[PDB]
Design a binder for this molecule. Structure first.
Ligand SMILES: [Mg+2]
Lengths: 1110, 99
RNA sequence: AGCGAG
């Protein structure tokens, strides 16, 4: 598939019809639609060339034409066009300027009376653009717009049961985009009733007479049910004008009722696009549900009285218990209640949709200012350039791409983390469910999620269910719904035609399962083929005449979950944790492709975008550690420049190194330089370690891990961490801050490394507390104490009148100094207002694995490192090879992630190599093994795809034949367990031990970032109780639960000490410090400062609180 | 994977209880009982099936196996997890709550 | 906002 790839042999018994799609398409295709690029134009024309209109073109078309109140003149917009980006991607990321392109739109002003047209490009602003990797660059930072899951606008029918009567009562909710809700609810009393804009109910006949229906017409249409006749009888409203009067008196009370503002009231509320835009998706959903305008294209999303009438008729028919209705002039549709969580009702607002909505808000604001100024515009003196104000639009875009919750800080711990930050569907944000208001029924898994959203990959905190990951093969409908591919099986004959069905269409079809054996004639080789049906119920099957079949296994899993071998042997909890923990692995220095992996490793690495791929075929002309120049087949040559030791958003390393020689011919799309967590182009998040699964001396107790010292000697679990420190000399009242090596009062030792110009030199090792940037801000005249003046005279110095505010290596940090980036106003570099210089120093440290660091496999088998043993007191096989890691056997059986053990066994086999003895045919357990897997050379990488893989029998067999290491000696019996020698005692352990090779990752929860301590430091502003956080010098919160625990202990003195002198009392604090430093007794504690703050707050609430002495 | 033994009578038990499930499905297809009653009957059938396969697994295991040794020494875990690991996981809950 | 432990 990919031109140059490692030959990872697979245990897969099923061929895949569809190749995995362009995993990043979710973002790039949506943005291309928004822009209206030629690529999107062609893609849409292939599939609906009737009306290809981009997002910006759509916004402009909806906005234009505009006219004033009189309509003497009008303005219009057309032909949006983008100029070339301002600066290249890397330079934009470097100098902190947004990666954007100018946007030009041709305006047109027509004075309807005089008859003049004036057109000119208007420069709507600097539109941020999406990098080819599917991500935005804003203020130098890397950001991702995550798709949002929202309730699709339309008509939703619900039914409930009332306790007071135990009767099934139905309801409808026409949910628009920025409209007014109309909930035709049916109460226990047999009378339908409207509730306009959530206002005190109505009889529906009142609205119908407000729409101008006659009671004869009302019984002509909604006459079949008794509920309707009952409503007409008990309504008591006689006349159209009576209904309109009552409706106006109820909707907008306090103003004098009329006839004009009674009619145009409703007409504007519902049937004018000014206030009730349903949007294209909303109108399409209403039409499909009610079967009104199925044939016609979509336009004028606003409603019609026909729609409301059909909604009422549908609700009443549903209450009666009908099955289908045929609206006059409309195709018949089935009467049934709607499910809000069904993926036929949850639509995706992709990046394009969100950006378009923000453009729409900005354009509405610009439209309003245009209209407001138009009154004060001198006729014939105005042109669109001087009539259009772009500031609201650019302001809206800028406030979206920054501080909008769906514009998230790109998560780059590794290529997989970035890839899965894309393809992420979050059910919360602007116009979406909030964690608090989100119920418990939206977080669950729905049958419609199969193939459209991963049921496994999901946050495990207070976000489970609200955030998910798009499946591998899932695609987004032009309308925002999520489609999934299926093989059309015709007359029991499976085919290759891949139809992309949304959830609704899937429900109407009896869809089969991927692993249904096929007779090789296209037809099912058995009756009783497993299937799913409309209600989401998996049950028995009608043999033959199944309309669709799954494209392939793993259709339901996402990219992260598709990289867990033996997923089917792991409980959903452990699989979920493994998926969420693959994204936390730090990039190691080396990276090794797993012995046991899947088919998703290579594609994930390629599509993540952090691995260099040749654009076009050619012969590598010259390769070096910093760039690769390749000569193409026709004259031209191209140079790819690697990104060496760059810092990612999360502090990790982003090193890229070539993997091609100086003469190799490379085809288009071939990997030519692996990325951070990549090995020969395939993803590599961790290392393969020789593992024993025994309990060892209580050091691997409760999910703790004991590692050999080899892993620290050979430096296999080690990560480069780059940390950036920023400091900017500003303009202050007393003057300006200088960056130089003249820091006041500090000696010539700690001013040693600092360059001639201040900032420290490159390659200068710095430990916590050292000076990076020597800065000196002015102090202004103050009052030196008599003691200090005397001391200065004795030691002959001067006040210097300038304080120090130097940048220093914050506490607990260390490392070399990669490079310094200096921006300066004097050299005319863009900097914020009132700053002269801004210097950033990059400090890199090579972290080695040490106890407290968090490790994990791919099966949710996490754990911190309890101990790092010397290699000599490490269990070693009979051969003499020490084991690298020791997990505990007490964590496997009950957490139900036996898959890891399977992986272990397979890993060992892959490490040793095997030969199935096919002397007399193939063994019965190897009959269905793919050819060429009968023989594997030692250290052979293998793949076990997610839900088709190495069956247990095949693993048993391959474990039996495990061709010997170096002499004739099989270190692992057929059971998979090896006889280990004790490192310390020297005797063999009495029983064999499960030994193998587990691929374990080093998670980004390193103890160096977790350790923190405090004795005294900053104190908060309004209250004492020092600042919290390791970032500051933070004290550990002693909450109310801890204080209750202390009260239960009966320890009154320690609790008083904690809550008074350790935290708040501002006089006993320095006193306790003095007592400790001088050896005196700790003093009596006083009144905490927070209590007096409370007393003042209460008094300022006009509450006379006084502390009576007695 | 060699320390996790499946029960050798599993397929016979599955056949014996799928026969009853098929009988219930026939009965439903002839209008004998409504959807809820058929669902309850099938739930009962498969609950009994899970119980029986669990008993077979329990009686098949040696008393020396690390799995059963850990479970039955009070160290950790219950036998339901062992049955889930080898044998039949049993019925599963609907998202609403039902079986 | 994402994220960790329970
Ligand atoms: Mg824990």
């Amino acid at each position: 598939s990919v031109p140059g790839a490692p030959n990872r042999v697979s245990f897969a018994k099923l061929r895949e019809p569809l190749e995995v799609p362009g995993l990043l398409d979710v973002q790039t295709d949506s943005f291309e639609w928004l822009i209206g690029s030629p690529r999107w134009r062609e893609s849409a024309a292939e599939r609906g060339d009737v009306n290809p209109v981009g997002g910006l073109e759509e916004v402009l078309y909806e906005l234009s034409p505009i006219e004033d109140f009189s309509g003497s003149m009008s303005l219009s917009f057309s032909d949006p066009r983008f100029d070339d980006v301002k600066a290249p991607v890397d330079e934009c990321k470097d100098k902190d300027m947004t990666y954007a392109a100018p946007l030009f739109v041709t305006a047109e002003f027509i004075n309807n009376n005089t008859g003049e047209i004036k057109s000119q490009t208007v420069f709507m602003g600097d539109f941020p653009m999406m990098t080819e990797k599917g991500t935005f660059i804003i203020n130098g930072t890397e950001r991702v717009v995550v798709s949002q899951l929202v309730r699709s606008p339309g008509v939703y029918f619900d039914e409930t049961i009332d306790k007071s009567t135990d009767k099934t009562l139905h309801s409808v909710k026409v949910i628009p985009s920025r409209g007014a809700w109309l909930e035709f609810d049916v109460d226990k009393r047999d009378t339908v009733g409207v509730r306009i804009d959530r206002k005190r109910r109505q009889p529906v006949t009142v609205l119908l007479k407000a729409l101008g229906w006659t009671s004869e017409q009302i019984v002509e249409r909604f006459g079949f049910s008794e509920i309707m006749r009952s409503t007409l009888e008990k309504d008591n409203t006689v006349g159209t004008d009576e209904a309109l009067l009552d409706i106006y008196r109820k909707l907008r009370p306090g103003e004098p009722p009329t006839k004009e503002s009674a009619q145009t009231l409703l007409e504007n509320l519902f049937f004018k696009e000014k206030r009730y835009d349903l949007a294209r998706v909303g109108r399409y959903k209403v039409n499909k549900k009610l079967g009104l305008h199925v044939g016609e294209p979509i336009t004028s999303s606003t409603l019609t009285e026909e729609d409301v009438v059909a909604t009422i008729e549908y609700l009443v028919r549903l209450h009666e218990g009908q099955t289908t209705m045929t609206v006059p002039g409309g195709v018949e549709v089935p009467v049934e209640t709607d499910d809000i969580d069904h993926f036929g009702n949850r639509r995706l607002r992709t990046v394009g949709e969100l950006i378009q909505n923000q453009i729409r808000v900005g354009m509405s604001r610009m439209e309003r200012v245009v209209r407001e100024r138009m009154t004060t515009q001198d006729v014939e003196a105005i042109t669109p350039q001087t009539l259009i104000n772009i500031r609201p639009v650019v302001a809206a875009i800028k406030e979206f791409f920054g501080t909008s919750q769906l514009s998230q800080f790109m998560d780059q711990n590794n290529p997989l983390s970035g890839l899965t930050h894309k393809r992420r569907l979050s059910a919360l944000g602007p116009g979406g469910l909030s964690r608090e208001r989100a119920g418990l029924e939206v977080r669950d898994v729905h049958p419609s999620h199969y193939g459209r959203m991963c049921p496994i990959e999901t946050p495990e905190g207070p976000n489970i269910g609200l955030i998910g990951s798009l499946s591998v093969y899932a695609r987004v409908n032009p309308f925002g719904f999520i489609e999934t591919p299926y093989r059309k099986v015709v007359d029991g004959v499976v085919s290759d035609e891949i139809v992309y069905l949304t959830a609704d269409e899937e429900d109407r079809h009896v869809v089969a399962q991927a692993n249904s054996p096929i007779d090789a004639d296209g037809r099912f080789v058995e009756p009783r083929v497993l299937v799913r049906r409309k209600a989401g119920e998996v049950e028995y099957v009608p043999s033959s005449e199944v309309d669709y079949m799954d494209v392939s296994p793993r259709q339901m899993v996402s990219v992260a979950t598709a990289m867990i071998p033996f997923l089917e042997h792991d409980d959903a909890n452990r699989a979920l944790m493994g998926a969420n923990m693959q994204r936390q692995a730090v990039p190691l220095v080396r990276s090794e492709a797993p012995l046991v992996g899947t088919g998703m490793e290579l594609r994930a690495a390629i599509d993540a975008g952090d691995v260099v791929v040749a654009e076009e075929s050619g012969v590598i002309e010259e390769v070096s550690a910093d760039y690769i120049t390749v000569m193409h087949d026709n004259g031209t040559r191209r140079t790819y420049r690697m990104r060496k030791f760059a810092r990612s958003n999360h502090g990790t390393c982003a090193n890229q190194c070539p993997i091609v020689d100086a003469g190799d011919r490379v085809e288009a799309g071939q990997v030519i330089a692996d990325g951070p967590c990549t090995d020969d182009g395939e993803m590599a998040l961790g290392k393969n370690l020789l593992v024993a699964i025994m309990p060892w001396e209580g050091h691997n107790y409760e999910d703790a891990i004991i590692l050999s010292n080899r892993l620290v000697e050979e430096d296999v679990l080690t990560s480069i961490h780059i940390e950036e420190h920023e400091i900017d000399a500003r303009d202050t009242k007393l003057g300006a801050e200088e960056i130089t090596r003249d820091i006041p009062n500090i000696s010539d030792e700690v001013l040693a490394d600092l360059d001639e110009r201040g900032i420290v030199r490159i390659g200068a090792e710095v430990r916590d507390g050292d000076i990076l940037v020597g800065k000196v801000t002015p102090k202004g005249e103050t009052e030196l104490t008599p003691e200090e003046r005397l001391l200065r005279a004795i030691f002959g110095e001067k006040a210097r009148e300038v304080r120090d505010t130097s940048l220093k290596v914050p506490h607990g940090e260390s490392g070399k100094v990669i490079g310094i980036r200096v921006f300066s106003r004097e050299d005319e570099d863009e900097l914020p207002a009132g700053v002269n210089e801004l210097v950033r120093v990059y400090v890199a440290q090579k972290r080695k694995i040490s106890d407290g660091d968090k490790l994990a496999g791919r099966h949710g088998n996490k754990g911190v490192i309890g101990k790092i043993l010397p290699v000599e007191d490490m269990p070693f096989l009979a051969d003499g090879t020490p084991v690298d890691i020791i997990l505990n056997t007490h964590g496997v059986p009950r957490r139900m992630n036996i898959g890891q053990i399977l992986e272990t066994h397979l890993g060992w086999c892959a490490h040793s190599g095997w030969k199935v003895d096919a002397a007399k045919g193939v063994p019965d357990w190897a009959a269905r093994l793919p050819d060429e897997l009968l023989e594997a050379q030692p250290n052979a990488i293998v793949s076990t795809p997610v839900f088709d893989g190495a069956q247990e029998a095949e693993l048993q067999g391959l474990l039996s034949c495990t061709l010997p290491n170096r002499d004739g000696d099989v270190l692992v019996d057929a059971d998979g367990k090896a006889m280990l020698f004790d490192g310390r005692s020297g005797e063999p352990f009495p029983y064999p031990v499960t030994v193998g090779y587990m691929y374990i990752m080093k998670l980004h929860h390193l103890v160096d970032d977790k350790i923190h301590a405090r004795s005294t430091g900053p104190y908060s502003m309004i209250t004492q109780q020092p600042l919290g956080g390791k970032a500051q010098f933070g004290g550990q919160r002693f909450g109310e639960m801890e204080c209750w625990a202390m009260q239960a202990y009966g320890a009154a003195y320690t609790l008083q000490e904690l809550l008074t002198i350790k935290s708040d009392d501002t006089v006993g604090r320095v006193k306790v410090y003095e007592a400790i430093v001088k050896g005196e007794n700790i003093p009596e504690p006083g009144i905490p400062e927070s209590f007096k703050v409370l007393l003042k707050e209460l008094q300022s609430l006009c509450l006379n609180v006084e502390v009576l002495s007695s | 994977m060699a320390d996790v033994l499946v029960p050798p009578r599993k397929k016979e038990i599955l056949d014996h209880y799928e026969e009853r499930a098929d009988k219930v499905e026939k009965q439903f297809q002839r209008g004998a009982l409504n959807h809820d009653e058929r669902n309850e009957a099938l739930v009962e059938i498969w609950k009994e099936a899970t119980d029986e396969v669990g008993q077979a697994l329990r009686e098949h295991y040696p008393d020396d196996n690390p799995i059963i040794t850990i479970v039955d020494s009070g160290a950790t875990g219950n036998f339901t997890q062992t049955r889930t690991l080898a044998g039949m996981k049993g019925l599963v809950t609907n998202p609403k709550g039902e079986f």
